[PDB]
Amino acid sequence: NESVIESCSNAVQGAANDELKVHYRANEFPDDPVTHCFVRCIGLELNLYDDKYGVDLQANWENLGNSDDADEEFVAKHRACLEAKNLETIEDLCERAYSAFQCLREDYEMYQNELWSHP
Ligand SMILES: [N+]
Ligand SMILES: [N+]
Ligand SMILES: [N+]
């Protein structure tokens, strides 16, 4: 939402940038260090993500326009995607969050057009 975008743009060094914010409001998240930290911030703020427990799959399911229990195949597919990314070995917390969210890229794009993965 608007609120979390403005707050994270202030929280993250470099993110209060006109050009990046145009992308962010268009749901476009480039692979750059500032945007890495921005994506982490939004995930933390919306309770979609956690540095330790990873991606909250039920929370994201709901953020994809659903009010019910996540489909089993949605959970399975993303748990597997996230495990394959070996997130625990990614030392940079922003890079780790960005890499995590890449698993859910296709879902968010389709939509636009607790079930922690690491319990
Ligand atoms: N962040
Ligand atoms: N299911
Ligand atoms: N992982």
What brief labels describe this structure?
119 residues, mainly alpha, Recoverin, domain 1, two-stranded antiparallel sheet, 7 helices, binds ammonium ion
Enumerate the distinct ligands: ammonium ion
Order the strands across the largest sheet as they lie in space: 1-2
Tally of DSSP β-strands: 2
Query: What would you say the CATH architecture is?
Result: Orthogonal Bundle
DSSP helix fraction? 55-70%
What is the rounded Rg?
Answer: 14 Å
CATH superfamily: Pheromone/general odorant binding protein domain
Shape: globular
What structural class results from the helix and strand content? mainly alpha
The CATH topology is Recoverin, domain 1
Number of helices: 7
Q: In total, how many domains does the architecture comprise?
A: 1
CATH class: Mainly Alpha
β-sheet strand percentage: under 5%
- How far do the termini sit from each other? 27 Å
Largest sheet entry:
2 strands, antiparallel
Secondary-structure element order, as H and E? HHHEEHHHH
Keywords: Disulfide bond, Secreted, Signal
Protein name: AGAP010409-PA
Family: Belongs to the PBP/GOBP family.
Disulfide bonds: 8-41, 37-94, 81-103
